Amino acid sequence: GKKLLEAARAGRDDEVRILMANGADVNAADVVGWTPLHLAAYWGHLEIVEVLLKNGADVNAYDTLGSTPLHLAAHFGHLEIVEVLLKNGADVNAKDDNGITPLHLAANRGHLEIVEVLLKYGADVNAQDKFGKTAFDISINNGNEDLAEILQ
């Protein structure tokens, strides 16, 4: 499992199936609660996200602060991974311990295509975080006029 967490982070897509062929825990978690799916999402390893899901990896696994792989892919602008995760049933409205949603994170970093896909899969635009801010509030604050209009 530790080898899988490492293989996942490195993008060694080959090593990943070899270990899973030897039955490594697909939901193996590291010290901050990140699974192999968390790490692939983070470093943009599409192939490994795909292989992990097909081997029953928990698509809604969360880390010790409530953040999910969809949070990570959305925040870091990995469009394809966001799509894959949503297809495999990722909670589009998942909240981390701060009440921050994938939509919040995508909005904050101006990931327009990602916001659209999230909206498509039914992300709640009214969702507030712990400070009562929505994706819309963020767009206005950031001066993103493109995004601000998409949130209408």
Binding site: V31, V32, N141, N142, G143
Partner: protein, 96 residues
């Protein structure tokens, strides 16, 4: 004047919101024996873009409305000073 602010308020907000904070560690020395986690705590980091400087918060009104730095100033990359302008054969240039 319109928001009852001064360059002193502007300078204060920039010092506060364009900060790079030393914030310590989780599980740093001396630890409680048995600690598995050692990680840096990352707090404020320097701003990197005109957009970030623009949304610096100067104040919220009685009304809840926000006054940002872009509401009292233009923000842009520009020279530390504007005293030296060079040309090469009449064309804009720089040099060493």
């Amino acid at each position: 004047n319109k928001f009852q602010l001064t360059p002193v308020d502007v300078i204060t907000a920039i010092k506060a919101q364009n900060a790079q904070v030393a914030a310590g560690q989780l599980g740093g020395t001396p630890p409680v024996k048995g600690q598995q986690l050692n990680a840096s705590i990352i707090a404020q980091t320097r701003l990197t873009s005109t957009e970030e400087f623009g949304k610096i918060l100067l104040k919220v009104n009685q009304d809840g409305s926000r006054v940002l730095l872009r509401d009292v100033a233009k923000i842009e990359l520009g020279g530390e000073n504007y005293d030296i302008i060079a040309e090469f054969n009449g064309q804009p240039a720089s040099g060493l």
